[PDB]
Structures are given as structure tokens and as C-alpha cells.
Automatic annotation (TrEMBL), chains B, C, D:
InterPro entries: ArAA_b-elim_lyase/Thr_aldolase, Low_specificity_L-TA-like, PyrdxlP-dep_Trfase, PyrdxlP-dep_Trfase_major, PyrdxlP-dep_Trfase_small. Ca(2+) 1 binds at residues 10, 198, 232. This is L-allo-threonine aldolase. Gene3D superfamilies: Aspartate Aminotransferase, domain 1, Type I PLP-dependent aspartate aminotransferase-like (Major domain). It holds the Pfam family Beta_elim_lyase. One of its GO terms (biological process) is L-threonine catabolic process. It comes from Thermotoga maritima (strain ATCC 43589 / DSM 3109 / JCM 10099 / NBRC 100826 / MSB8). Its cofactor is pyridoxal 5'-phosphate. Pyridoxal 5'-phosphate binds at residues 58-59, 171, 231. Belongs to the threonine aldolase family. GO terms for molecular function: L-allo-threonine aldolase activity; metal ion binding.
Length: 344, 343, 343, 343
């Protein structure tokens, strides 16, 4: 088989999950009658210190229903220049909510509070209303970097003074929590809503969850219906979600250790990586000192049994997760070492 | 509890539960889930189309179809009492920026002539009619079957005008079972068809959209945008395969149970028209009862029967896999006792 | 050419041309155009409203109103043959992302009970009904006057449910002249009204929206987004002030001409209903002619008479300031000759 | 009041007022306004394009162009500080459902390589890059002129990828007078161009979009949808024709006044860069003043000079036909007095 370092989304269900899904107690969620979904949402709200939660088929929908519930047509959403909502969500914010993204550069996912402040639009007929500020914790593009709690706190203070909503794209908020030691409820305390994925490092086959106030979640639920996320006996999926949330968080530390090990060794080989920047499950490798670009290196890697994604023409992203063991990492490293000789 | 609210409440068969537990999966975003791929392969084959796309719900199936078939500002001709127009949260306006052009119909069948008259002529003031939608086994009219000839004639009109045709076939198999018309035959007269796996076919989640390759490619991107792009969705697809391949024939049982239920309810004295029961739905009027539909629904629940009121004077009863003949007979004994109380 | 196509073809009076040439202007984006400001003050005053907004067209007038009254996904109740649904290029769906909810009407008058029944109940499957629109002097039906009683009732219903009411008053003055109902009284039963200056009132460009200060503020911003935020628009407002203050009374002349036209056409043998002609429009059916509406329209054009077909069997004739009684007589001689050829 | 806020405040010349009063008009919706038709013919010819469209504002000109070049979910590459992104009410997201893709630029000139990298790869997660917009005489950077070579290289990239190119030429004639490059040459490297008549050219209302026949047809329909479809707009076009054919040359006077203003402000001690002033705009920084941009604008107003702050430390000064050398000289006396007070 292949050593899959493309993403943590490829994680497969554990034995415990397969069993729980196949024997899930279910109901029609449209009627709010699926017991497993209801327990998953109750558990999620509780974990994040929020009043309510909403299960969704993907993180993308989690983000989009949140944007829909937080905005009105013609509004502007302040977000990080390299955030997922801006680059990888098919421009849904424009089509679905009719809102404009207001890109603010960030240092490792951390937008400077004063830059966010300046990004807020003055009340002028020429300008749309800034109604939402979005923050991504463990910013993907920058290498799964951890946004400091103080950063989020400061932005919350600015949002409050202006009456602006705050949404945290916490797709990998648990990785951030494991790395920082900050409980997720703390990050959530400085936001109106938080979306987090169950289908990545937590290993569930499908789904993400949005948490927030009752009225917000009710609005998000209606948005979910409109977008087509209103499923029937979704308890089959939620069963795995419950296990992800309750038993797969602590072991994320193993993915971080594997990623750091990978980074340190890649550095020793001579690759352009920064082990000092690796705090969660991602490693960015630049092909600057290689005689091939990102795409060419990805092909050579595939040809040698290693799978990864090019994130630019000069950068590759390596992601660790439950289905890549330390031994798998060592195997990949031995291959990376030989390839270094070939392309250096 | 005897649940006659809708066929959406069907639960997974033992066969499905086993298949879900041992389902082979992969990341669908990369098109690497083997079970999802097989489900879509089977669905396309079944409806005689080039491709298929699995979606979380029928609503998304309809919406990605509309998006893939239209451009902002277009108009969509659809039946005045269709699900897309009534129960899809106005998604077509928000997601596709298109306007509905309601055409009345007789039990889901729009007069072909009225369809032709609803097509907008080319003029700067008018939107472009780019899609015509037909719902088979029309929900609101009481689960009626739209004649194949009606669909055939509308298709001809569409072709002559270069307009796409979408069949909302959430319950197209019920239509096929009742009419004897194969689903491929219905499909042949349409550009795309959405059908549900999560209703009478008993899958826990999902529907499927079938059509040409280019159409499906556009719909797949629309699905990503809407949030329907899942990961190891093979677990759901495993139940979906069983639903598509082995749960169709038994739909005849739901039809029989519905008719039997209607005939007996009429015998008791309830205001029902057994002659109108074509598929798995029975409409019950409450005009002769001491309490309206909402009050009667509560009496029913207290006695162990679940049903929905669709108006102050109407209740809809829906049969499905999880409503056996025994359950029907038990429900009738309850209806009998309640008639003595509320007539 | 005797132009009976629409009252939009009206050309500026000498008084207007002079007023435009000497118009005092400023930058409207800064709210500094004094002539625009006066036009809006006068418009608000005339309709008994708090504020007013000048727009480049009636279509923008209706659309900024819809945007200001609704949110994405909302539903808008409107008459089945209203201009907003048929002649505004599906703008409501694209610009506001809203769903139209057509309701049948008798010459523009929707039965109040049907409106009440069109209001969506609070359910996750349904959009929220946030607006009801009424067109006074309903175009399609032949410039018919909607009864004030009808408007009052719908207003009462709207209040109960907290729904906004917008009156498409493109020809509200024609309705007032014929009914004897002051435009301020019509306006009192609505949250917003759009009326045109560019039709019967003869201004070359523009309409105005009137309503509450906050609503107008939202409409103004919508106007900026749509591209209606002009600069020295006082040039157009000068003609607008004259249209609003000096051209209302003479509308009776267009009505007289329209009625006379209809009476004579009936005597010739054409399918018209002189008794239904109360303002400046005449609907002419072609069911008793050798050619349909499109064929008859071309014949009329070749003979010097311009009109538009509103369907395959109906032609709309409209009178206005640029059509004198003499022009009507000449037209009648032409219609007389064409009846011999096509009856 | 000496108005240096913008060139939008320009008022009609006597020649224009007379032309508007004597304007030959018609109903534009039927394409029958002779003056609008000639303005569009002239605009098209002037820019070396086959068609043109008159619009109520530059904002609508840009937006109908975006609508006609894109499909829902598309992405539009544009300069980070461009008007379309910052000053058009987020209209591109609402009207066309498209995403802006900001690219840094040096005085309006995006590096061609950056543009190349901003184009989205074909992937399900990414919107399709279907349009690249370029603003000539980039407003925010001080009315800077984008080099013809920059537009030429971007055009090559666009062609290579089958992507449309739109030039926001609101002040493209200022660019042409300063650079010596004919507007038809800039436009030769674009698919469409929008230019304003209501700014430095002194028309009271409007802009014009030029491009291919089909594109313009789509833009015309978009205009109808947005509410820009006017009637006897010839009154406005009459002034537009004069603006286009007689007000271009004198733009050099505005540039001369801007330069003179910059040189004297520098001489006084203000933070300005005369070397950066190539058209009708001067950027003044408040860095060496005991007050911020907002406080300074207030001081200028109390002394009789109007200007706009574009940031907390920068104010924009704009020259035009209604700010003569005398006014500049008078303004300088005020600036001199204020410098003593705030330095
Ligand atoms: C920060 C972030 N946010 C939102 C999403 C969307 O979730 P879905 O894929 O479930 O829609 C992703 C997925 N990112 C894919 C990856 O990093 O490989 C993500 O990384
Ligand atoms: C009732 C009504 N409402 C709104 C509009 C739109 O106004 P503009 O044409 O200025 O956009 C019209 C024009 N109707 C076309 C006609 O009767 O000739 C109309 O008749
Ligand atoms: C480059 C540019 N583009 C488009 C527009 C929009 O045109 P309208 O204002 O006619 O909609 C403006 C106006 N700019 C105002 C100013 O700079 O003072 C502009 O400067
Ligand atoms: Ca997974
Ligand atoms: Ca090893
Ligand atoms: Ca089911
Ligand atoms: Ca007119
Ligand atoms: Ca001007
Ligand atoms: Ca002098
Ligand atoms: Cl169960
Ligand atoms: Cl909204
Ligand atoms: Cl597997
Ligand atoms: Cl589109
Ligand atoms: Cl003036
Ligand atoms: Cl004229």
C-alpha cells in the first residue's frame, strides 16, 4: 500500500466505529428524532461550552451555514488572506450568502488585531457592512499553525465593540488544543460560533459540527435544510462522531509527535523545512533547493510509494494522522533521503 | 408506535446494517471511495444514463440539478404543487438565482399546452426559460402517478425549444411499480433525474442524481459548493446499493397496504377515497369528526399511531417497509375505537 | 406613426426642456443636488410619507423596494400577472434571492382570503413571507383600477402577520384620476409605493419610491449597489417636478381618448370591452381575426399604427399626451380598413 | 467653497445645457433614442469596438460588465486597491455571485507574473477565474497611469487561458492625455472597457461600456435587470456626446492645475510628491502635521476648502473643470495659513 501523507481526511473508521455505526439507534433527523445525532450535538455543545450544536455533512457546509446565519446580502466577511473559506470553498460565500470576503494578511494564521480593526468598514453608502470576522485555528495553509488564544481574545473584544459576529473555523481546533493545552471551550468563549471536523484527525467517516447559541443554531439549521444537509437517519454517521469526539482526541498527540519527527529528520537530510514551525500534524516542504518543482516532486514521491499534495508550485504539504504509523514515517523518510540525492 | 407519517422514517434492514459495518471506504473528494463509485455506477446503469452523483438529500439532488441546468436570472417551469416550489426553503432563488414559473397540474400532470405557453419568448424584459421540472408520484396531490404520455409530450416541447428537463423522482420507483413503466423509460424523456434512497427504499441517508457526464460534472462541483462533498461516504453507499438493488420490488407491498388501509377506513366511516389511493399515500379528511386534523392527530398519538396533518381538515397516512400488514390491522382497530369517540 | 405601444413614449414638454436646461444641480451621491432633493421632498409630501428616493426606472424602483423589505430566501406574495413577475427579467431572484408566490387576481385584485392562505407558516421547509405587492392600475388586465377596499383588507392582513406591503404604483395617478381616491389615501395602506414620472406624466426619465425614513435609507444603499447612484441628476429631476405637479390633471384626457378608441373599435367589430376601459389602456383580442396578435401588429405597423402584442391573442393599446383625439380618429380609420382585410 | 473632493462634482457647460434642452429623444427600451444611439456609436468607434452601452453610472457599467463576463461562482482577478473591490457596495457578490481575487499592484500595475499565479487551477475546490479587471488611472494610488505594456502582457496571459479582460477606464481619458496612448489602443488589449462621462468630461450623468456585440447584448439585458433601462435618456446623452467629443483635450488643464497645486504645497512644506502627480490627483500626507487626515479635512472645510480623507494620514485632492487656477491659488493661501497652524 501507499504511505498517504496527502491529508488527515483519508482516515478510516476504527473497528469500534464500524460496529457503532452498524448498530446505531436512529430516527428521522428532519423531525429531530434521531437519538444518536441528538446525543452527538448535546455532547458537542457541552464540550465547547455552548448552548446548541448542529451536525453537518462537511466542514464546508459547517462554515457556509454559519456565514449564512451571521450575515445579510451585501455584507463583508473579514477573514485571513490564506484561509480555507476564501480559497477552498468554491466561492460559496458569494453564491450562497451574497457576501464579500475582506482578506487580511496574517502571520501564521494570526491576523493582527489592529489590522482587523482597520478592515472594519465605516458606515458609508459606498461600503458593504462588516458583519462577520472569521478565524481559522491551526491555520491550514501556513502549516497547521496554532493561533494564540490571546489573538482570538483581542479580536473578540474588537468585534464586540462593533457588534460584529465572530466565527471560528475550527476544522482542526482539537489539534490546536492538544498542542497549546488550551481547552476548546476557551477558544469558543471568544466566538459566536465554531465549526469543527470529525472526519479528519478524529477519524470519523463523515461530518463536522457547528456550535453556538440556540437562536443562531436554529438559523443555521434552516440554512442546512436549504443547502440540502437535512438528512434522515443520520444516526449512522453520528455514532462514529460520538466516538471521534470522546475517544480520538488524546491520540492526536501521536500525530503531532510523528509530524515533528518527520520534520526534524527531513531537516537533517537537507530538505527545506522548519521543524521549529511544526506544532501540530503538518509539515511544509519547499522545493527551492531541489532541481524539480512541487508538482514534479509529488510525481516522484508517488512513483516511490508516498502520497502528498502540492499547495503551490514550490511547496508541498505533508500531513500525519492515525493511518500513518511511526514505521510508515520511517519508511517515507528513507525514501525522502534517496530522493534528496536524486534531486539535490 | 405505528408510524404512518411518511416513508422517510424507514429504518435500515439487517442486511444494510451488516453491509455498513464492513463497507470498503475511501476519500470521496478524491473519488477514492469504492462503494460510492459502485453505487453511482449502478444508479447510472439502472436509469440508462451516462453518470450519477450521490447526495446527502433529495433537496440537494434537486438544487445541484437546477444549478447545473441554469444560469442566474433564468426561469424554471414547474408544477404549482411540486416539492421544489413548496418545501425546498426557496433554495432555487438563493442558490441559483432563478425564478419559478408555477404551472397548475391535474395530480402532478401539467397540461402540455400550458407548459408551451409558460415558455418565455426572447425579449429583454423576460428571463430565459432553461428548465422544466416534473415530479413523479406527485406528493401534494396524494402520491399520484404522472402518465408517461404527459412526460413524453413535455419532453418533445422541451427538445423543440432547447430546454432541459429534470424529473424530481424522489418516489419514481413507486410510480414505476404502480404504472408498470420501467424507470429507464421515464428517464429517457429527461436530461436528469433525482431519486431518493432514504424513503421507501429504506436507506438511512441520501438520494442520487443521474444524467449526462458534463451535467453530472457540473452538479458534482455544485455539490462541493453546497457542502455535500463528504469523505468516507462509502458507509452510507453500502446501504444505498442494497436499497437500489433489492428494495424496489417490495414497494408493491406498501401500495397494497395503503389500499387495504383506505378501504377499511372508509368502511369504518372515515372520510377517505380508496379510489384515489394509487401508491403509498392515503388522505384522510376530518370534516365529519368532532375535532379537526390537529386534534385528531393528538388522539391518534395517544393511542399509538403517528400521522401528520397537512391542513386543518386533512391528515396524510403513509405506508412503508416499517408498517407491516399486522401494523395496519392494529392501526385499524385503533381507528375503529377512535371513530366511536370522535364521530 | 400613431404610437399606441405605451405611455412611456411620451416626450418632454417645452416647459420641461427649459427647466432641464436651467436646472440647479449638485452631486447626488453627496446628497447635494437641490433639484433632486426638492423632487423627493415633494414626492414624500404628496404621498404622505416620511421620505422619497429618485431612481432611473420603475424597475429599479420595484427592485430596491424588494431588497429593502426582504432578506435572502424570503417569499414575496404578488399578483399572478403583475409586472414584477413578468416584465422585470427575474430581477427579484437574482438581486434579492427571493421567491415569488403568485396569487390569482381579478383584474389585479387578489382575493384577501387567498392572500391570507399564501402566507407561509413557520416551518423549516418554508421561506418566510416578508412582503406582499399590489399593482395599482394593473397593467396586464388593461390598466384596471384595484379597489381601495381590496387594498385596505390586504393591508389589515399584512399588519396581523407583520408583513410589509409595497404598491407598484407605476400608474397610481391614473388610478386616482379614475377612482377619485387621493394617492395619499392609497399610500396610507402600504409601507412603500413606487410611482413613475416617465409614463403618463411625461418625464423623460425616472420614477420615485416613497416610504419610511429607514426603509428609504436601505433603498438608497440598494440603489448605490445597483448602479442608480447618479451625479447631477437634477437635470432629470427638473422635468420630474413638473411631471408630478403639472401633468396629473390632464391624465383624464388620455382616459377619454382610450374610452373613445375602445367604443369605436367595438362598433367596427373588434373584440374589445369598452366597459372595462377606465384608464388609458385598451385590450384587443384577435380571436375573431384572420391573423393572430403578432400578425395583426405587423399589419398595423405597415399602416402607421404601433402597438405591442401581450400574448398570441391579445394586443395592448395605450393612450398618452402624444396621442391627440385627432390621432385616435386617424387610427380608427386605419383600424376600420384593417377590419375589412382581417375580419 | 473650493471643491477638491472629486471630479464628479463637475457641472454642465452652457453648451451642454442647450444641447439637453434641444435633445432629439425616443424610447431607449425600443432602441429608438437617436441621441443615445449616436453616443453609443461614437463611443464604440472611439474605442475601436463594435458596440457600446450607455449606463446611469460607472458602478453599473462595471457590474453589468462583470455579469456579462461571468457565471455564478466564478472568480474575478482585480487590483487590491481597485474601486470595484472597495467602493461598489459589494455588488459583485450580490449581483453576479462571484468572488474577488485581490492581487497587489504597484500604482495600479499588477505584476503580470502575479496575475498568472492568481489564476485558479482546474480543481473542484476552486472557483473558475473567468475575468481580470484593470483600472486605468488607478484612483487609490493617486490617479496613476497603468503602462500600456502592463495591460499588453496581461492580455497575452488572459488569451492563453481563455479569460476575459475588462478595463475600469472611469478616467481612461486622463490616462490617455498623460501617456499619449489613444483609448482605442488600451482597449485593443481588453474585451471590454467602461469609461465615465460624468467626471472630468463634465457630463451630469452617466458612463458607457464598450465591447463586442454579443457581450454588449448581455450587458444590455443586465442593465435592464438592474434598473438602468431608461426611456428618453437622450436628454442625458446629448451632454454625453459633448463630453466625449469636446471635453477631452482640456483635461490637460486639470493635470496642469494638479501639478501646480502639488509643487506649491511642497514649497509650503506639506508632505506631497509632485513627481507622482501625472493626472488630476494629488495625495497629501498629514505625517508632519499636529493633526490626522480627518481633523485636517475639518480644518480645510471651516476655511472653505473641500477634500476627502482616504486614510487616517492621507487626503486626496482632485482637480477638474470647476476648480480653476484662481481657485487653486486661493486654496493655496488657505493651505499656507493652515500649515503655520498645524506644522
Ligand atoms: C481549515 C479547514 N476548514 C474547512 C474545511 C472543509 O471541510 P470539509 O472538507 O469536510 O468540507 C477543511 C478541509 N480541508 C482539507 C485538507 O486540509 O486536506 C479545512 O482544512
Ligand atoms: C406596473 C408597472 N410597474 C413597473 C414598471 C417598470 O418601469 P420601467 O419601465 O421604468 O422600468 C412598468 C413599465 N411597464 C412597461 C409598459 O407598460 O410599457 C409597469 O407598467
Ligand atoms: C476608477 C473608478 N471606477 C468606477 C467608479 C464608479 O463610478 P460612479 O461613481 O459613476 O458609479 C469611480 C467613481 N469614483 C468616485 C471618485 O473617485 O471620486 C471610479 O473612480
Ligand atoms: Ca476520514
Ligand atoms: Ca522502520
Ligand atoms: Ca429512511
Ligand atoms: Ca416618457
Ligand atoms: Ca459631473
Ligand atoms: Ca489669477
Ligand atoms: Cl434504530
Ligand atoms: Cl439577506
Ligand atoms: Cl475500507
Ligand atoms: Cl450564471
Ligand atoms: Cl447648477
Ligand atoms: Cl425629440
Amino acid at each position: 500500500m501507499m504511505i498517504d501523507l496527502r491529508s488527515d481526511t483519508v482516515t478510516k473508521p476504527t473497528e469500534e466505529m464500524r460496529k457503532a455505526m452498524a448498530q446505531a439507534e436512529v430516527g428521522d433527523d428532519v423531525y429531530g428524532e434521531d437519538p444518536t445525532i441528538n446525543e452527538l450535538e448535546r455532547l458537542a455543545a457541552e464540550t465547547f461550552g455552548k448552548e446548541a450544536a448542529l451536525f453537518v455533512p462537511s466542514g464546508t457546509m459547517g462554515n457556509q451555514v454559519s456565514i449564512m446565519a451571521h450575515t445579510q446580502r451585501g455584507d463583508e466577511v473579514i477573514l485571513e488572506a490564506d484561509s480555507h473559506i476564501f480559497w477552498y470553498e468554491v466561492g460559496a460565500m458569494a453564491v450562497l450568502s451574497g457576501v464579500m470576503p475582506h482578506p487580511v494578511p496574517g502571520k501564521n494564521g494570526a491576523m493582527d488585531p489592529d489590522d482587523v480593526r482597520k478592515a472594519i468598514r465605516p458606515r458609508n453608502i459606498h461600503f458593504p457592512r462588516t458583519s462577520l470576522i472569521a478565524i481559522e485555528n491551526t491555520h491550514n495553509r501556513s502549516g497547521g499553525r496554532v493561533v494564540p488564544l490571546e489573538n482570538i481574545k483581542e479580536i473578540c473584544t474588537i468585534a464586540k465593540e462593533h457588534g460584529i459576529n465572530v466565527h471560528i473555523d475550527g476544522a482542526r481546533i482539537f489539534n490546536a488544543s492538544i498542542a497549546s493545552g488550551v481547552p476548546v471551550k476557551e477558544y469558543a468563549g471568544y466566538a459566536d460560533s465554531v465549526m469543527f471536523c470529525l472526519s479528519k484527525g478524529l477519524c470519523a467517516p463523515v461530518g463536522s459540527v457547528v456550535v453556538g447559541d440556540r437562536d443562531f443554531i436554529e438559523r443555521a439549521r434552516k440554512a442546512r435544510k436549504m443547502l440540502g444537509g437535512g438528512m434522515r437517519q443520520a444516526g449512522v454517521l453520528a455514532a462514529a462522531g460520538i466516538i471521534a469526539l470522546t475517544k480520538m482526541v488524546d491520540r492526536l498527540k501521536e500525530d503531532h509527535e510523528n509530524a515533528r519527527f518527520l520534520a526534524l529528520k527531513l531537516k537533517e537530510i537537507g530538505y527545506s523545512v522548519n521543524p521549529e514551525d511544526v506544532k501540530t500534524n503538518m509539515v511544509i516542504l519547499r522545493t527551492d533547493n531541489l532541481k524539480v518543482n512541487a508538482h514534479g516532486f509529488i510525481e516522484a514521491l508517488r512513483n516511490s510509494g508516498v502520497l502528498a499534495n502540492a499547495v503551490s508550485d514550490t511547496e508541498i504539504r505533508l500531513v500525519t494522522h492515525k493511518d500513518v504509523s511511526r514505521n510508515d514515517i520511517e519508511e517515507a523518510l528513507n525514501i525522502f533521503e534517496k530522493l534528496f540525492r536524486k534531486f539535490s
